[PDB]
Structure 1
Amino acid sequence: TYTTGSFQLILASLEIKPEAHVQELEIRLDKDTRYLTQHTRNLQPGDTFHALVEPIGEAPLPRLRLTDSGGKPLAFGLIDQPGESVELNYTCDQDICELVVHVDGTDGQKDSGEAVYRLLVGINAPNLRESGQTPVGSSVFLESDLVTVGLAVDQIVGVDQRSENFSVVGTLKLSWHDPKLGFSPDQCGCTVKSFEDASIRAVAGEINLPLPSFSFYNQQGNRWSQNQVIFVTPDGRASYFERFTVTLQAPDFDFLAYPFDRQKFSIKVDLAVPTNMFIFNEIERFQQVVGDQLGEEEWVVTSYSQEITEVPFERGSTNSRFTTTLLVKRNLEYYILRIFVPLFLIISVSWVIFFLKDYGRQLEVASGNLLVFVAFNFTISGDLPRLGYLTVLDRFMIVSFCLTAIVVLISVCQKRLGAVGKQAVAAQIDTWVLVIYPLVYSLYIIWVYLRFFTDH
């Protein structure tokens, strides 16, 4: 491969004209974007810069300007004699001067909808329009650096359902190509430069060059990082590797359907630098995301999705965000067998005591079974979590407890009626409850299914 760098020697000229090259950009003006700026290269002295925006789908005619790095004006925009399109030209007088082109509908603040404009920007090219060989030349705008990010989850360390957070351990890999990080292997005598036990912010501080520092968006407390390493190659390729144990705050935990609720564990990694500097380009599948574990697990990952977006950043603009969403589900066998089958038997005995016509024994068994219900209710008190609101399991337990209280009450009333002498009505009540009790239970089950697991 060829090599690039800055050197010194212990002038002449190139042909008769400097290299000239132009590019295009489709800029979208919307409600959330009424202004745009684009940065350029050094523009060695004597180079000329030409800009021209035109409207495609309408004629809003957004104004153009050209400023320096700090925003001091260098060139204004004058509309041409023919209709539509604008022309801007500027020739520099100092070396290493950066230019920023501004497009703005400052006077056209009326809002109707999104609009598209075609902007042609060229350097050293006096061409009136694009003409030909547009992509053969180099890009004139400063392009955001491309970084590939990969996240894998070794295991879900824990879930705290009251403070709504979850602790996860995994590995994070970043990989970009910034030639300013490059070096000549002649001096160091090695093909890799290594930084260890230091975050990207620290190495950026001790190198004083921009680097794609990141952060876990919903991190609580100090992340536990190990195997933290940064490898840099002479060709500018840089890679960051970290193995992290992090407690992430999850404000989207919906435990209303517990233990049938399905949760979304979102691990968001936000780039700490603006979009104009670095962007998450693609996702590296260096290893499986969920991973394989031996033995069962409290939370099982139904599916996963890694996806890259852009979200607003402090002081204007946006930054990239890499989100890994895990669709986790509880172990339904555990709650079905440990809770629901014993509860079904406990309510079934209270149902079956109505066949007895000895209402003294019926009453005593009903009271004993209500005590049994309470004892089992609190036996299952660890899996049931101490949230401050109700839960479909909690609602079911409350309803079943109320029905057992009602069976005790009905047993008392039936014994009273038998003592009075109205045994026929007591038998009628027996046979009525024998059929309405399962009906009430089934109706409540259907109602809670409709209320929490579907619409209406």
Structure 2
Amino acid sequence: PPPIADEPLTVNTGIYLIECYSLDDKAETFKVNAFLSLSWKDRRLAFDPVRSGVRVKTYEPEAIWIPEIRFVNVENARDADVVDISVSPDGTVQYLERFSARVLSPLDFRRYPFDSQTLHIYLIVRSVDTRNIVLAVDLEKVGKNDDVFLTGWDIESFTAVVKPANFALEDRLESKLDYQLRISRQYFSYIPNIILPMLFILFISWTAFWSTSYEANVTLVVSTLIAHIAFNILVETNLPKTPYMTYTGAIIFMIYLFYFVAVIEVTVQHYLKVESQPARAASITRASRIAFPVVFLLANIILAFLFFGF
């Protein structure tokens, strides 16, 4: 029984994030539990303050006509249990629920460990004979407690795009709003646990420049290369199949090279020291000692700049 209007009836939305959790980098989803605040004039149940009852009148959902606010990017039906409904006398309805859905928003691992993100919640609303425009009431959208969690992420700001998007979808205009959650990652644990460890093994790799034993230079560079895959794999796991390149996928892959040419050198400093020409051997070996760290540190500046500095 939709409220007999004279024009597109506007419905007034808001979202108070009570809880944030389970942001899943692989699945590109997160889980939110929040308030959903709605309101609209249904003059059709305006009601004589003095003549009866009190200031505001409470209803159950079945009584009143309520607009179907479906979320757009959601695994399943959003799990909202209802909070209160209060009709003003001007037939203005005050609705409040408290849902929990898991939300499908995409992420940009281009700067993987040092990445900031922007999440989205949607809310469409399909029309019947009266159109529905949705729109944001900002006193009920300050939604986000002084408690919101989201492990391993610093939470920057919860806002929304005042102007809705009115589509036509199947001979019935719908109206969709954009609620925005901005977060930066707490890169850090990414250092003592990945970044540094990964580097260390790489240095020991090329300990093999100040050595001459092949057996202990392969027992050297090879043994560490194994370890690097242990990281490449550790990392590749908590991360989806990007069709593009990650920052650390980059340096992690750039690394694979420095092990190759490293192994190349130790290898040459052999078919070039068994050929009686150690003139050249401890010439090259002596050189690599510099080339390598420089080319590297150079490539990181080159690489790093390429990603953040552009």
Q: Which interval holds the TM-score relative to the shorter structure? A: 0.7 to 0.9
Q: Alpha-carbon deviation of 1:359?
A: 4.6
* 1:193 and 2:48 matched: no
In 2, distance between residues paired with 1:149 and 1:295? Answer: 23
Q: Alpha-carbon deviation of 1:350?
A: 1.9
Asked if structure 2 preserves the Cα contact closer than 8 Å seen for 1:156 and 1:169, the reply is yes
* 1:303 and 2:167 matched: no
In 1, distance between residues paired with 2:120 and 2:141? Answer: 19
Q: Alpha-carbon deviation of 1:270?
A: 2.1
**Aligned residue in 2 for 1:148:** 12
Asked if structure 1 preserves the Cα contact closer than 8 Å seen for 2:214 and 2:266, the reply is yes
Q: Alpha-carbon deviation of 1:231?
A: 2.1
What runs of 5+ residues in structure 2 fail to find an aligned partner?
none
Q: For residue 261 of structure 1, what is the amino acid of its counterpart?
A: D
**Aligned residue in 1 for 2:73:** 218
In 2, distance between residues paired with 1:218 and 1:375? Answer: 36
* 1:264 and 2:118 matched: yes
In 1, distance between residues paired with 2:165 and 2:242? Answer: 35
Count the aligned residue pairs: 304
Asked if structure 1 preserves the Cα contact closer than 8 Å seen for 2:131 and 2:173, the reply is no
**Aligned residue in 2 for 1:242:** 97
Which structure has more relative contact order (CA 8 Å, sep 6+)? It is 2
Q: Alpha-carbon deviation of 1:241?
A: 0.7
**Aligned residue in 2 for 1:171:** 35
Q: Alpha-carbon deviation of 1:173?
A: 0.6
What runs of 5+ residues in structure 1 fail to find an aligned partner?
1-40, 42-140
Q: Kindly tell me: are residues 162 and 367 of structure 1, through their superposed partners in 2, closer, same or farther at Cα, counting changes over 3 Å? A: closer
Equivalent of residue 333 in structure 1, options 181, 188, 191: 188
* 1:416 and 2:281 matched: no
- Could you tell me the TM-score, scaled by structure 1's length? 0.58
Q: Indicate the SS of the match to 1:214.
A: coil
Equivalent of residue 292 in structure 1, options 146, 149, 158: 146
- Could you tell me the TM-score, scaled by structure 2's length? 0.82
In 1, distance between residues paired with 2:141 and 2:77? Answer: 25
Q: Alpha-carbon deviation of 1:182?
A: 2.5
Q: Indicate the SS of the match to 2:227.
A: helix
In 2, distance between residues paired with 1:236 and 1:160? Answer: 43
Q: Alpha-carbon deviation of 1:343?
A: 1.1
Q: For residue 248 of structure 1, what is the amino acid of its counterpart?
A: V
Asked if structure 2 preserves the Cα contact closer than 8 Å seen for 1:222 and 1:246, the reply is yes
* 1:427 and 2:282 matched: yes
Q: Alpha-carbon deviation of 1:447?
A: 3.8
Q: Indicate the SS of the match to 1:334.
A: coil
Q: Alpha-carbon deviation of 1:360?
A: 4.3
In 1, distance between residues paired with 2:142 and 2:192? Answer: 32
Q: Alpha-carbon deviation of 1:189?
A: 4.4
In 1, distance between residues paired with 2:116 and 2:108? Answer: 8
Q: Indicate the SS of the match to 1:329.
A: strand
Q: For residue 15 of structure 2, what is the amino acid of its counterpart?
A: L
**Aligned residue in 2 for 1:25:** none
Q: Indicate the SS of the match to 1:365.
A: helix
Q: For residue 243 of structure 1, what is the amino acid of its counterpart?
A: R
Q: Alpha-carbon deviation of 1:454?
A: 5.0
**Aligned residue in 2 for 1:353:** 208
Q: Alpha-carbon deviation of 1:281?
A: 4.6
- Of Structure 1 and Structure 2, the greater strand share is in 1
Whichever of the two has the greater Rg, that structure is: 1
**Aligned residue in 1 for 2:88:** 233
> 1:72-91, aligned counterparts within 5 Å?
none
* CA offsets 1:269-313 (integer angstroms, 9 cap, x no match): 223337964433542324743333387722322233212223213
Q: Kindly tell me: are residues 154 and 353 of structure 1, through their superposed partners in 2, closer, same or farther at Cα, counting changes over 3 Å? A: farther
Identity of aligned residues (%): 24
Q: Indicate the SS of the match to 2:79.
A: strand
Q: Alpha-carbon deviation of 1:418?
A: 2.4
**Aligned residue in 2 for 1:394:** 249
Q: Kindly tell me: are residues 386 and 249 of structure 1, through their superposed partners in 2, closer, same or farther at Cα, counting changes over 3 Å? A: closer
* 1:180 and 2:44 matched: yes
Q: For residue 271 of structure 1, what is the amino acid of its counterpart?
A: V
* CA offsets 1:44-97 (integer angstroms, 9 cap, x no match): xxxxxxxxxxxxxxxxxxxxxxxxxxxxxxxxxxxxxxxxxxxxxxxxxxxxxx
In 1, distance between residues paired with 2:53 and 2:94? Answer: 20
Q: Alpha-carbon deviation of 1:243?
A: 1.0
In 1, distance between residues paired with 2:175 and 2:28? Answer: 25
Asked if structure 2 preserves the Cα contact closer than 8 Å seen for 1:274 and 1:320, the reply is no
> 1:76-115, aligned counterparts within 5 Å?
none
Q: Kindly tell me: are residues 291 and 427 of structure 1, through their superposed partners in 2, closer, same or farther at Cα, counting changes over 3 Å? A: farther
* CA offsets 1:327-355 (integer angstroms, 9 cap, x no match): 22221112233211111111122233312
Which has the larger displacement, 433-442 or 289-298? Answer: 289-298
Aligned-residue CA RMSD in angstroms?
A: 3.2
Q: Alpha-carbon deviation of 1:240?
A: 1.1
Q: Kindly tell me: are residues 275 and 302 of structure 1, through their superposed partners in 2, closer, same or farther at Cα, counting changes over 3 Å? A: farther
